[PDB]
Design a protein around this ligand. Structure first.
Ligand SMILES: O=C(CCCC[C@@H]1SC[C@@H]2NC(=O)N[C@@H]21)NC1CCN(c2ccncc2)CC1
Ligand SMILES: O=C(CCCC[C@@H]1SC[C@@H]2NC(=O)N[C@@H]21)NC1CCN(c2ccncc2)CC1
Ligand SMILES: O=C(CCCC[C@@H]1SC[C@@H]2NC(=O)N[C@@H]21)NC1CCN(c2ccncc2)CC1
Ligand SMILES: O=C(CCCC[C@@H]1SC[C@@H]2NC(=O)N[C@@H]21)NC1CCN(c2ccncc2)CC1
Lengths: 123, 123, 123, 123
């Protein structure tokens, strides 16, 4: 009933596969079409399992650490956003991507951006 | 060996209790001293379980959805940052806090900020 | 030659009117179609007046304080982004919107988002 | 009366020299102690010249493009924040630093961070 479980695609062509559990959990895999990434990475997150009923979206977030058996990019992305249902359902997000840095370079550790996920792929 | 498992406190006085699993998982609870929050909330996230050895920090992230048995603030925060070890260990983060909004208000859904966690409480 | 001077429209329908001076200055007016805003506000900013020639965009930023003769929303937005030329020229930005807050509420002062500007209006 | 005009120092040791004009303008120079920066750069911005009187801070923002006669880092930073007066006056900010990138790399153009400015230097 949450509308979230399934496969989602962003504007870069990345693939977000997620299960929204009854307890508020998000689990799944992420495959990025961009950056220092190859194949699937574990993700986990949380969502509001009792959202408002006034047309507001459903708040959520998740994390990927960019380490798997094929690569380690010494970094992690978190996406914070909301699911907005309907015939053209979307998950609208903004993200923070932190790379490990020495203390001297810590000020320059974190990229910010935004991803829009839909249930069908962009062309 | 990761240095992450345990209790951490930020500059607001919030309490972050986390277990860093051997597989890269973060699990635990978060108690915020600020905002529309009461008692403990579930968190989950990920960290780089094989960080660089050049003095760089360990990248990580986690999510809290602000729903428990006592409150629902129809929102979720993700923290993205890194752990920096030593005698004054820290987790330096930046966060995104998305609230569910109607489509018309979506542009105004997301707060950004920064939290510094240490192993002893601020005064 | 910079391609920046003129009128630009974002996805909300806001109107950004700017002059890019030879010295790196941006001046102009901003009219927001969203939020606590009415009519035109002063803006000022800066851009890279000698960008790279490898196809990279031109970095820039500007600020609006949301006070004019008709409203005061006790807030300011900064947009940071780049101009990307061509037949479908764009200014791709991300923004930070800070509202004045008491010290206790300072953690919740700042919204983040993203605006895409084009030379013709969205429909 | 605004409290803003003068010299300010952040936690990196950078020096922000600003004049707050009666019309809401900020002008001055910025010297960064970090990154691809040498000597002083022009800045310009805006502030709320009629802030609330309830103890809330004064909203403001400014931009530096990282080009002067000595360097060009093909980038620009905007700081968005507020001035909080008193015996230990501060300007609390968050910033976005966009670097020119090709279209393919645009997703990775923008760093985010936070700077705290005070009227005396850190040690
Ligand atoms: O490229 C990756 C890992 C893959 C990220 C993919 C990103 S996630 C948000 C966006 N949405 C997607 O679907 N895909 C992209 N990691 C880097 C990034 C840049 N890095 C630094 C280093 C130093 N300072 C700052 C940044 C080094 C490590
Ligand atoms: O207050 C909370 C839940 C608790 C958040 C606590 C935050 S997490 C980052 C920081 N670090 C901490 O340790 N504690 C704080 N949620 C709101 C926030 C403001 N909300 C909106 C609504 C509409 N538009 C924008 C924002 C409504 C819901
Ligand atoms: O609405 C405005 C002024 C107009 C902003 C228009 C925005 S600029 C980025 C975006 N692009 C546009 O073209 N238009 C929009 N200001 C508020 C916002 C919310 N405010 C708070 C208060 C307390 N905490 C957090 C936030 C109160 C003051
Ligand atoms: O280093 C500078 C210019 C000086 C910035 C100084 C910064 S301003 C916020 C902070 N507060 C200060 O007082 N000082 C620092 N510019 C870069 C940054 C990293 N760059 C990229 C490239 C590609 N992708 C992402 C990022 C390349 C250009």
């Amino acid at each position: 009933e949450a509308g979230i479980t399934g496969t989602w695609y962003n504007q870069l062509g990345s693939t977000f596969i997620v299960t929204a559990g009854a307890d508020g959990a998000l689990t799944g895999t992420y495959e990025s079409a961009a950056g220092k990434a190859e194949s699937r990475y574990v993700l986990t997150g949380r969502y509001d399992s009792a959202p408002a009923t006034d047309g507001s979206g459903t708040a959520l977030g998740w994390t990927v650490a960019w380490k798997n058996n094929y690569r380690n990019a010494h970094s992690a992305t978190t996406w914070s956003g909301q699911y907005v249902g309907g015939a053209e359902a979307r998950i609208n997000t903004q993200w923070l991507l932190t790379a490990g840095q020495t203390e001297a370079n810590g000020w320059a550790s974190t990229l910010v951006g935004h991803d829009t996920f839909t249930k069908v792929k962009p062309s």
